[PDB]
């Protein structure tokens, strides 16, 4: 009934606002720091640790200012939240790969503009 | 996709657990009950971002505990059909492939894996590799899988990945 | 099924490494039935294709492939000796046994000339040697070795044509004979199922020109003929009379076993011992707490512990240290040194002989970089206590490492690229730790998001991520090694008696428990600079420069 290839989401996931992997890492590390202080509170869930380490391994934007810059550059583009987050997380390098990993980008943007956006992504990717 | 949404949950506070500070008890209760949970309609409940609104406490007639409807910003995740997601390989098997997306276990069957990526127990880590041995998918790798679909279940949305389409496999 | 190798391996334990080739099928090698040994002691190689070959020794492809394999695993010198015992059914045409197996005999002699090192030995089973073809082959062996004889042991049944040719001392410059016999075998393969055949390899006039050789050959043939005739008539008489018997078989067998040093005890002991009981058996009452000692971390506060420098050796670590016990074949178990921990079966495709006790780490070896990188799990041996039954814990550390390279070279797998490799760690002298940092490189590892990671490259083109460096003391209590500037040689000094000697004192030897207890570990985590490309030098952590400067100040 649902299909992420054509943005087929349930009615519950209509107001769903996406998050970046670096955003999740930063917020969950802030939660972990809160857990470090404010004693008489036990450890968080195994889900918390797994998600935190998983998004720490796959983090691509090492700076919150980088997060803000990417969000500002992509939010002014005519994209859905899901497409925006998927592009900012997978980070493709060729427009063909951008349209292949996300088949809902077929015709949304011009492939030259899409390649410009991908080059902007590779420009704003905090390398390691 | 990692989501930032607002969710509504009701907390039952019994009079023995009121205390001098009542709202902090409710906040601890919410951080206890829903963190790390998983629902079929909202996915993996990762964490609660900010407890926004605390509703009026309705004393249940006959019952002693008060009921608090609570609205809270929350970070969650939900696997989707056809979404290409990065993953960490945990085990390579002759039947399938055990990978992880956050806390989610993803099983990619070899039947939906192209004929190039053959299985080899003969390498010391049993791995997926081609006869050219260019793409070597093994344990603790960074790969990408297009989710065929997910088994939505009680506190579990474990997914099934795909490698059939283009640009799928090792990063 | 490698009975010869079963004897040799049972007698030499881990102190021998064997290479075997035989025909695939019902008469293939049975490694799992060896009283001792393992797959990584007697390593089969079946010709072209390696372990996927058919093992036919009469094929030139298999000959060249097995020769290259044996040379690649013997420092290109060859084996110390070769044994060949080839045969097959000649039922219905038994009298033509020598002719029907002429090519097998030629190929076995040729394999001797192909893989046996200079001064090496060679024993081969033959049959009747009436034809000039076989006699010429024996003459070639007699020209190629320093001494040859024809012998029939009493364990060879007296009524058959079986005998053995024993050759010692392969001469230098036998390569022309080797090439010649290779060519003759090729011609033999080309004349199969035809009316032609190679009937001479050495002219009859050359053989008969040597009167001594011909005299010995004729006398051997005739004495064997008379003995075999008597035995055959004896079997015939025992057919025509079933009451006749030798009443002396039991006593003769007893005396033979006593003479040859073969204990009169059966194989039947599957040693289905659990790893814990076998570990207690192998340590022979040594205190178990010795195996629980953690290494002393090398810090600025503990740097003075390595002050002697010459007393110490060092090696690069790639994982946490573990103990490993081998119960035979794939029954290999590991233990992390704590009394509370259980022995865990090792999930690696590798084999090792029974009664083996090792100090190891399980390393992830990497070949190539980036997306093309292949990864392999390997057993890296740090030290050895017992191998295949003989204890070595009291021998000097370098000697234990050399016996480890002995067994470990033996416990390897070139014919089975499908098996997990076993290696010895590269052991460096502490006053030569500078050589270690030259092998440290920053390489892009699969899954590091593009970040280069510190990597130590070994003797082959594989590398692993180092966790640190172990420092192991090899000289015992109040015994230490200095360097004499007048004699330009290292010497041993006794701190209690004040004696000095240039030879190794027996009591200066550090046994395994001293080496294990006194070991230090220099961790190589974040903030530690050991390669010039990674300088987040935490000022509280020892760098490569600090340790090297301390070592240099205390070499003099």
GROMACS .gro file of C-alpha atoms in nm, chain C residues 183-389:
model
  207
  482UNK     CA    1   6.112  -3.573  -2.155
  483UNK     CA    2   6.102  -3.955  -2.138
  484UNK     CA    3   5.781  -3.939  -1.934
  485UNK     CA    4   5.628  -3.709  -2.196
  486UNK     CA    5   5.713  -3.960  -2.470
  487UNK     CA    6   5.556  -4.234  -2.255
  488UNK     CA    7   5.234  -4.031  -2.235
  489UNK     CA    8   5.241  -3.991  -2.614
  490UNK     CA    9   5.277  -4.368  -2.675
  491UNK     CA   10   4.978  -4.476  -2.464
  492UNK     CA   11   4.737  -4.719  -2.633
  493UNK     CA   12   4.983  -4.758  -2.923
  494UNK     CA   13   5.206  -5.049  -3.024
  495UNK     CA   14   5.518  -4.850  -2.927
  496UNK     CA   15   5.687  -4.802  -2.589
  497UNK     CA   16   6.005  -4.664  -2.436
  498UNK     CA   17   6.202  -4.983  -2.369
  499UNK     CA   18   6.539  -4.830  -2.274
  500UNK     CA   19   6.641  -4.523  -2.076
  501UNK     CA   20   7.011  -4.618  -2.039
  502UNK     CA   21   7.188  -4.828  -2.306
  503UNK     CA   22   7.252  -5.187  -2.199
  504UNK     CA   23   7.620  -5.146  -2.288
  505UNK     CA   24   7.655  -4.856  -2.042
  506UNK     CA   25   7.486  -5.051  -1.762
  507UNK     CA   26   7.695  -5.363  -1.825
  508UNK     CA   27   8.008  -5.149  -1.865
  509UNK     CA   28   7.994  -5.089  -1.490
  510UNK     CA   29   8.089  -5.435  -1.366
  511UNK     CA   30   8.034  -5.348  -0.999
  512UNK     CA   31   7.682  -5.212  -1.056
  513UNK     CA   32   7.584  -5.510  -1.270
  514UNK     CA   33   7.728  -5.760  -1.020
  515UNK     CA   34   7.527  -5.605  -0.737
  516UNK     CA   35   7.211  -5.585  -0.951
  517UNK     CA   36   7.228  -5.949  -1.061
  518UNK     CA   37   7.301  -6.071  -0.709
  519UNK     CA   38   7.009  -5.871  -0.566
  520UNK     CA   39   6.766  -5.998  -0.830
  521UNK     CA   40   6.873  -6.359  -0.774
  522UNK     CA   41   6.867  -6.359  -0.393
  523UNK     CA   42   6.524  -6.194  -0.394
  524UNK     CA   43   6.409  -6.450  -0.652
  525UNK     CA   44   6.517  -6.745  -0.437
  526UNK     CA   45   6.355  -6.605  -0.121
  527UNK     CA   46   6.033  -6.524  -0.308
  528UNK     CA   47   6.024  -6.871  -0.468
  529UNK     CA   48   6.053  -7.033  -0.126
  530UNK     CA   49   5.777  -6.809   0.013
  531UNK     CA   50   5.546  -6.880  -0.283
  532UNK     CA   51   5.593  -7.256  -0.251
  533UNK     CA   52   5.530  -7.210   0.122
  534UNK     CA   53   5.197  -7.038   0.056
  535UNK     CA   54   5.109  -7.316  -0.188
  536UNK     CA   55   5.190  -7.582   0.073
  537UNK     CA   56   4.980  -7.395   0.331
  538UNK     CA   57   4.694  -7.402   0.079
  539UNK     CA   58   4.729  -7.778   0.028
  540UNK     CA   59   4.750  -7.827   0.408
  541UNK     CA   60   4.549  -7.601   0.639
  542UNK     CA   61   4.691  -7.747   0.963
  543UNK     CA   62   5.040  -7.606   0.901
  544UNK     CA   63   5.127  -7.279   1.073
  545UNK     CA   64   5.414  -7.068   1.202
  546UNK     CA   65   5.394  -7.098   1.584
  547UNK     CA   66   5.629  -6.801   1.628
  548UNK     CA   67   5.434  -6.504   1.485
  549UNK     CA   68   5.345  -6.353   1.824
  550UNK     CA   69   5.699  -6.359   1.967
  551UNK     CA   70   5.850  -6.236   1.639
  552UNK     CA   71   5.606  -5.944   1.630
  553UNK     CA   72   5.686  -5.861   1.993
  554UNK     CA   73   6.061  -5.861   1.927
  555UNK     CA   74   6.021  -5.649   1.613
  556UNK     CA   75   5.817  -5.386   1.797
  557UNK     CA   76   6.074  -5.381   2.078
  558UNK     CA   77   6.362  -5.347   1.831
  559UNK     CA   78   6.207  -5.067   1.625
  560UNK     CA   79   6.086  -4.866   1.925
  561UNK     CA   80   5.717  -4.899   1.836
  562UNK     CA   81   5.497  -4.912   2.149
  563UNK     CA   82   5.252  -5.205   2.153
  564UNK     CA   83   4.949  -4.986   2.223
  565UNK     CA   84   4.649  -4.941   1.994
  566UNK     CA   85   4.531  -4.624   1.819
  567UNK     CA   86   4.207  -4.637   2.011
  568UNK     CA   87   4.214  -4.311   2.207
  569UNK     CA   88   3.999  -4.057   2.017
  570UNK     CA   89   4.096  -3.801   2.282
  571UNK     CA   90   3.742  -3.668   2.295
  572UNK     CA   91   3.864  -3.448   2.579
  573UNK     CA   92   3.697  -3.120   2.656
  574UNK     CA   93   3.929  -2.819   2.611
  575UNK     CA   94   3.939  -2.738   2.985
  576UNK     CA   95   4.048  -3.085   3.097
  577UNK     CA   96   4.299  -3.101   2.812
  578UNK     CA   97   4.432  -2.759   2.911
  579UNK     CA   98   4.485  -2.880   3.268
  580UNK     CA   99   4.655  -3.191   3.131
  581UNK     CA  100   4.887  -2.986   2.910
  582UNK     CA  101   4.990  -2.735   3.179
  583UNK     CA  102   5.097  -3.025   3.406
  584UNK     CA  103   5.014  -2.858   3.736
  585UNK     CA  104   5.131  -2.507   3.648
  586UNK     CA  105   4.932  -2.246   3.840
  587UNK     CA  106   4.637  -2.129   3.631
  588UNK     CA  107   4.666  -1.771   3.759
  589UNK     CA  108   4.980  -1.733   3.545
  590UNK     CA  109   4.748  -1.731   3.242
  591UNK     CA  110   4.537  -1.443   3.380
  592UNK     CA  111   4.810  -1.178   3.410
  593UNK     CA  112   4.738  -0.857   3.220
  594UNK     CA  113   5.024  -0.667   3.052
  595UNK     CA  114   5.177  -0.362   3.215
  596UNK     CA  115   5.081  -0.054   3.016
  597UNK     CA  116   5.380   0.138   2.885
  598UNK     CA  117   5.356   0.497   3.009
  599UNK     CA  118   5.593   0.774   3.110
  600UNK     CA  119   5.574   0.629   3.463
  601UNK     CA  120   5.656   0.273   3.348
  602UNK     CA  121   5.912   0.355   3.077
  603UNK     CA  122   6.203   0.273   3.309
  604UNK     CA  123   6.090  -0.091   3.315
  605UNK     CA  124   6.235  -0.146   2.966
  606UNK     CA  125   6.566   0.013   3.065
  607UNK     CA  126   6.789  -0.292   2.986
  608UNK     CA  127   6.660  -0.280   2.624
  609UNK     CA  128   6.872  -0.578   2.515
  610UNK     CA  129   6.674  -0.801   2.754
  611UNK     CA  130   6.359  -0.730   2.552
  612UNK     CA  131   6.189  -0.813   2.223
  613UNK     CA  132   5.887  -0.643   2.069
  614UNK     CA  133   5.605  -0.724   1.828
  615UNK     CA  134   5.311  -0.536   1.677
  616UNK     CA  135   4.967  -0.639   1.805
  617UNK     CA  136   4.647  -0.638   1.601
  618UNK     CA  137   4.395  -0.775   1.850
  619UNK     CA  138   4.360  -0.879   2.212
  620UNK     CA  139   4.579  -1.168   2.325
  621UNK     CA  140   4.414  -1.508   2.367
  622UNK     CA  141   4.512  -1.867   2.439
  623UNK     CA  142   4.442  -2.134   2.178
  624UNK     CA  143   4.426  -2.512   2.225
  625UNK     CA  144   4.420  -2.767   1.944
  626UNK     CA  145   4.247  -3.100   1.998
  627UNK     CA  146   4.301  -3.222   1.641
  628UNK     CA  147   4.170  -3.118   1.297
  629UNK     CA  148   3.904  -2.842   1.328
  630UNK     CA  149   3.856  -2.890   1.705
  631UNK     CA  150   4.024  -2.561   1.794
  632UNK     CA  151   3.922  -2.355   2.098
  633UNK     CA  152   4.022  -2.017   2.240
  634UNK     CA  153   4.024  -1.875   2.593
  635UNK     CA  154   4.078  -1.519   2.715
  636UNK     CA  155   4.279  -1.609   3.027
  637UNK     CA  156   4.016  -1.549   3.296
  638UNK     CA  157   3.908  -1.840   3.516
  639UNK     CA  158   3.545  -1.736   3.466
  640UNK     CA  159   3.560  -1.750   3.085
  641UNK     CA  160   3.459  -2.058   2.888
  642UNK     CA  161   3.658  -2.213   2.605
  643UNK     CA  162   3.503  -2.093   2.278
  644UNK     CA  163   3.525  -2.295   1.958
  645UNK     CA  164   3.715  -2.103   1.690
  646UNK     CA  165   3.495  -2.018   1.391
  647UNK     CA  166   3.773  -2.031   1.133
  648UNK     CA  167   3.847  -2.279   0.852
  649UNK     CA  168   4.177  -2.408   0.987
  650UNK     CA  169   4.324  -2.726   1.134
  651UNK     CA  170   4.596  -2.799   1.390
  652UNK     CA  171   4.737  -3.114   1.552
  653UNK     CA  172   4.617  -3.241   1.890
  654UNK     CA  173   4.808  -3.150   2.209
  655UNK     CA  174   4.887  -2.796   2.087
  656UNK     CA  175   4.877  -2.495   2.321
  657UNK     CA  176   4.946  -2.146   2.186
  658UNK     CA  177   4.941  -1.779   2.280
  659UNK     CA  178   4.776  -1.605   1.985
  660UNK     CA  179   4.573  -1.311   1.860
  661UNK     CA  180   4.303  -1.322   1.592
  662UNK     CA  181   4.391  -1.059   1.332
  663UNK     CA  182   4.189  -0.913   1.043
  664UNK     CA  183   4.434  -0.906   0.752
  665UNK     CA  184   4.362  -0.665   0.466
  666UNK     CA  185   4.478  -0.676   0.103
  667UNK     CA  186   4.423  -0.375  -0.121
  668UNK     CA  187   4.248  -0.053  -0.026
  669UNK     CA  188   3.913   0.115  -0.068
  670UNK     CA  189   3.633  -0.067  -0.245
  671UNK     CA  190   3.859  -0.345  -0.375
  672UNK     CA  191   3.995  -0.433  -0.030
  673UNK     CA  192   3.978  -0.801   0.065
  674UNK     CA  193   3.981  -0.902   0.432
  675UNK     CA  194   4.091  -1.229   0.591
  676UNK     CA  195   4.095  -1.343   0.954
  677UNK     CA  196   4.424  -1.500   1.058
  678UNK     CA  197   4.579  -1.664   1.363
  679UNK     CA  198   4.891  -1.470   1.460
  680UNK     CA  199   5.103  -1.660   1.712
  681UNK     CA  200   5.265  -1.453   1.988
  682UNK     CA  201   5.428  -1.735   2.188
  683UNK     CA  202   5.410  -2.114   2.222
  684UNK     CA  203   5.387  -2.350   2.520
  685UNK     CA  204   5.307  -2.697   2.385
  686UNK     CA  205   5.287  -2.806   2.023
  687UNK     CA  206   5.151  -3.151   1.925
  688UNK     CA  207   5.271  -3.296   2.256
   0.00000   0.00000   0.00000
